[PDB]
């Protein structure tokens, strides 16, 4: 039903894969190698000349957040109403902003910029702890009473930052319990422990 | 008014949502934040991500310009007529956001040394929108479906500021050109665009465009 077209890395497809798995969905992975990409035809056929590319029936989508939002809308992972939907987007956009800063670090100046990035991290993670504290004491989800698509994206972002800076969640009790809680959902837990996830590099330049 | 926009005195990331509100005949309050106020630090520390725009829809307080655009798109019916169009609208907006981030990097961090390469790469960055437009009714109406969506105000602002950055950049794209003309002629939007409230605000905060 679903097909994910992407390079052999977790990157911008980790969240959407976690979402599919946790939700019991089935999908096909169409892996694109660098040689295949450098050939030029696939790229030229992509709307924005980039991956991921996603297929749902005969609907083809581009843009990782468009895919996440589409799955959130069709599978009911977008809040109970417009008010919560706006809050879900606010969380996702906040995640996207930090993922971009992370990507810039990883691909453009890991070596010289890592120390400054790590020092600024607490202040970049805190907004999510505050959001959790404002909804049911942070005991359940970040928005409302049900999981939303933005949470798979936030979970991946937290997971890759713990790799980048072990212990970065330690001073954030709500985020820490949230990560353990989400990571324990049965289907998500199996997915996170599987080779499909574990043996795929986080990024394409071997940095993390 | 049920809406309040809190931002610096620039068009920037608030131009598209303002256009949307004006084009939809909605009322809103403009709360202007000066640089001195910002440097004072307390408004900033109270902002969810330490940044503006901040938006209030009654007691619903939002941050993130695209969260605000999506919210208004959802509450005003500018988000497609079904799930498939909603996804396409999002795809347009995410593409707009990506190019806006590049424009922003150019403007604030590398104007002098980067403008040549930026402009040379610009046609390749605009083409996807021409392609999207060509695939919907021959590009004679909206970018997605048969009604206007929130992404379009964002796309229109993006195209307008790029024409200031690179005069004639749209001459290579017939559909985008006529599209801009079309949207810019909507009565309420046209009036807004020619008004002091829009015209007397700089596009960016460092004086470059
Ligand atoms: N805004 C896009 C960004 C996609 C992107 O940066 N894709 C990269 C891989 S992470 C790519 O396709 N690179 C190959 C190229 O640009 O030629 C999204 O969120 O999906
Ligand atoms: N992803 C955010 C970005 C917001 C942003 O970059 N805000 C800038 C002004 S355009 C800001 O508040 N700068 C002040 C600061 O960071 O201290 C959005 O789309 O709203
Ligand atoms: Ca409630």
Same domain for B11 and B45, yes or no, is yes
Name which of A42, A63, A43 is nearest A54 in CA terms. A63
CATH number at residue B29: 3.40.30.10
Same domain for B22 and B117, yes or no, is no
Q: How far is CA A145 from the centre of its chain?
A: 20
Same domain for B109 and B176, yes or no, is yes
Same domain for A115 and A20, yes or no, is no
Q: Examine residue A52 and say whether the peptide bond preceding it is cis (omega within 30 degrees of 0).
A: yes
Name which of A80, A79, A75, A78 is nearest A24 in CA terms. A75
Q: Say yes or no for a CB contact (<8 Å) between A93 and B67.
A: yes
Same domain for B171 and B195, yes or no, is no
* β-sheet bridge partners, residue A30: A5
Q: How far is B196 from chain A (nearest CA, A)?
A: 31
CATH number at residue A157: 1.20.1050.10
CA–CA distance, B15 with B9 (Å, rounded to integer): 11
A141, A204, B46, B177, B203 from A182: Cα distances, Å: 9, 26, 28, 48, 42
- Tell me how far the alpha carbon of residue A144 lies from the centroid of ligand 3, in angstroms: 6
Q: Is B204 in the pocket of ligand 2 (CB under 6 A)?
A: no
The strand order across the sheet containing B28-32 reads B28-32, B3-7, B54-57, B60-63
> What's A32's DSSP letter?
P
> Nearest ligand to the C-alpha of residue A12?
1
Same domain for A44 and A29, yes or no, is yes
Task: Tell me if A2 sits within 8 A of A136, measured CB to CB.
Answer: no
Same domain for A96 and A42, yes or no, is no
Sign of CA dihedral A100, A103, A108, A112: positive
Which amino acid residue places its CA nearest to atom 1 of ligand 1?
Answer: A63
Same domain for B88 and B10, yes or no, is no
The structure was resolved experimentally with: X-ray
- Say what the resolution is, in angstroms: 2.0
Place of tokens 């015209």: B199
Same domain for B40 and B117, yes or no, is no
Domain containing residue B112: 79-186
A141, A175, B76, B109, B209 from A90: Cα distances, Å: 14, 17, 18, 26, 28
Same domain for B107 and B66, yes or no, is no
Same domain for A92 and A180, yes or no, is yes
Task: Tell me if A71 sits within 8 A of A19, measured CB to CB.
Answer: yes
Name which of A52, A159, A54 is nearest A98 in CA terms. A159
Which amino acid residue places its CA nearest to atom 18 of ligand 2?
Answer: B64
CA–CA distance, B189 with B130 (Å, rounded to integer): 22
**In chain B, how many domains are there?**
2
Residue B2 token pair: 């049920």
Same domain for B182 and B91, yes or no, is yes
Name which of B5, B42, B12 is nearest B26 in CA terms. B5
Q: Examine residue B75 and say whether the peptide bond preceding it is cis (omega within 30 degrees of 0).
A: no
Task: Tell me if B179 sits within 8 A of B133, measured CB to CB.
Answer: yes
A4, A60, B155 from B195: Cα distances, Å: 46, 40, 20
Does an H or E element contain A191, and which? Answer: helix A186-193
């Amino acid at each position: 039903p679903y097909t994910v077209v992407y390079f052999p890395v977790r990157g911008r497809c980790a969240a959407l894969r976690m979402l599919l798995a946790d939700q019991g969905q089935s999908w096909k992975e169409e892996v694109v190698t660098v040689e295949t990409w450098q050939e030029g035809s696939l790229k030229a056929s992509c709307l924005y000349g980039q991956l991921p590319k996603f297929q749902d029936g005969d609907l083809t989508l581009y843009q990782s957040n468009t895919i996440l939002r589409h799955l959130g809308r069709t599978l009911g992972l977008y809040g109970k109403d417009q008010q919560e939907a706006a809050l879900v987007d606010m969380v996702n956009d906040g995640v996207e902003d930090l993922r971009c800063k992370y990507i810039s670090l990883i691909y453009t100046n890991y070596e010289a910029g890592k120390d400054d990035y790590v020092k600024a991290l607490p202040g970049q993670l805190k907004p999510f702890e505050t959001l959790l504290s404002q909804n049911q004491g942070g005991k359940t989800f970040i928005v409302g009473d049900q999981i939303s698509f933005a949470e798979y994206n936030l979970l991946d972002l937290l997971l890759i930052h713990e790799v980048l800076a072990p212990g970065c969640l330690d001073a954030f009790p709500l985020l820490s319990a949230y990560v353990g809680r989400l990571s324990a959902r049965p289907k998500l837990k199996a997915f996170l422990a599987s080779p499909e996830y574990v043996n795929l590099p986080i990024n394409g330049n071997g940095k993390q």
